[PDB]
Amino acid sequence: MQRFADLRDRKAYAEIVDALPYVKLMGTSMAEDEQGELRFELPFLQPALHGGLIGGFMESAAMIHLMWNRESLEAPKIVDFSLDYLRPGRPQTLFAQCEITKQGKRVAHVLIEAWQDDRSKPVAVARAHFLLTNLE
Amino acid sequence: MQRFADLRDRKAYAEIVDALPYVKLMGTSMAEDEQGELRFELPFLQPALHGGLIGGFMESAAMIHLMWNRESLEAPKIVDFSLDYLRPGRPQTLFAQCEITKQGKRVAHVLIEAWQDDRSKPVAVARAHFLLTNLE
């Protein structure tokens, strides 16, 4: 997975995901905002995903966010993941951004928010815990 | 989604999923056991899904289980979904089966267990709540 550290520094968003199944999951787009942690995009419309399920997307975003914000040693290990669907999705692109809440030496806690028009009224909010092997 | 009710009665497992992104998510297989609720299969090995993430799989299985066990009126709506990763996965095929716990008039509670060699020592267990429009 060395190519990762190589693709991060190169900001190769387009292909860094080309070879991960979240493009094979959706049409996720990916880039960075102003001083804000990594941000994701998905064309929430209908190539279609019925049921409006996004667990896979949310879960991988949280994983990617972690290894994008950390030492690309090995992929962190997920312990658990929870998701609440708050409101139906609209025919607008779906934005998502994660935040690392507590980050002890071996465990990182991630919060993922998915919204469209108002991040104050998110479409869904998720949370994930990962176990890390920080060589620190 | 009429074709669904048509594909259920026809037990067309192979293509019923051909047109849902959980084959585009993994190599999910699907069939039925003896008197036991629907059962799923995935070749848990590495076309690869690193991080061992399976949230998308688990979430869709629980959805599919619901509409397979219910009136194919419209797809049920998910409210929330939680997942715990209990043990690493082995180079064996991953089995998964859901069970409907409480099933009031408008809400169904689903439990999904994913295991390989011993369902007593599952790889992961999930839970999901759905809102239904049972015309009953």
Written as one string, the DSSP assignment of B46-107 is ----GGG--HHHHHHHHHHHHHHSS--SS--EEEEEEEEE-S---SSPEEEEEEEEEE-SSE
How far apart CA A62 and CA A64 sit, in angstroms, is 6
Nearest to B24 among A1, A24, A55 (CB): A24
Do the Cβ atoms of A116 and A95 come closer than 8 Å?
Answer: yes
Distances (CA, A) of B33 to B20, B22, B30, B36: 22, 20, 10, 5
Partner residues linked to B110 by β-bridges: B100, B128
Q: Which long-range contacts (CB under 8 A, 24 or more apart) does A113-117 make?
A: A114/A54, A114/A58, A116/A44, A116/A89, A116/A90, A116/A92, A117/A90, A117/A92
Distances (CA, A) of A36 to A69, A100, B100: 12, 12, 41
Nearest to B75 among A51, A55, A81 (CB): A51
HEC sequence for A103-129: ECCCEEEEEEEEECCCCCCCCEEEEEE
Cα A20 to the center of its chain, rounded Å: 12
Residue located via tokens 């082995």 = B90
Nearest to B55 among A79, A81, A84 (CB): A81
Query: Residue B56 and residue A57: Cβ atoms within 8 Å?
Result: yes
Enter the DSSP assignment of A4.
H
Query: Residue B58 and residue A58: Cβ atoms within 8 Å?
Result: no
Question: Which residue type is seen at A125?
Answer: V
How far apart CA B95 and CA A26 sit, in angstroms, is 24
Domains of chain A: 2-136 (3.10.129.10)
Cα B4 to the center of its chain, rounded Å: 15
Query: Residue A50 and residue B20: Cβ atoms within 8 Å?
Result: yes
Extract the tokens encoding A116: 């469209």
Classified as helix, coil or strand, B127 is strand
Cα B129 to the center of its chain, rounded Å: 13
| Cβ neighbours for A125, distance < 8 A, ≥ 6 positions apart | A83, A84, A86, A111, A112, A113, A114
Residue located via tokens 């934005």 = A95
Neighbours of A96 (CB within 10 A): 26
Return phi, psi of residue B88, to 5°: -60, 160
Extract the tokens encoding B95: 């089995």
Neighbours of B129 (CB within 10 A): 20
Return phi, psi of residue B62, to 5°: -60, -35
Q: Resolution, rounded to a tenth of an Å?
A: 2.2
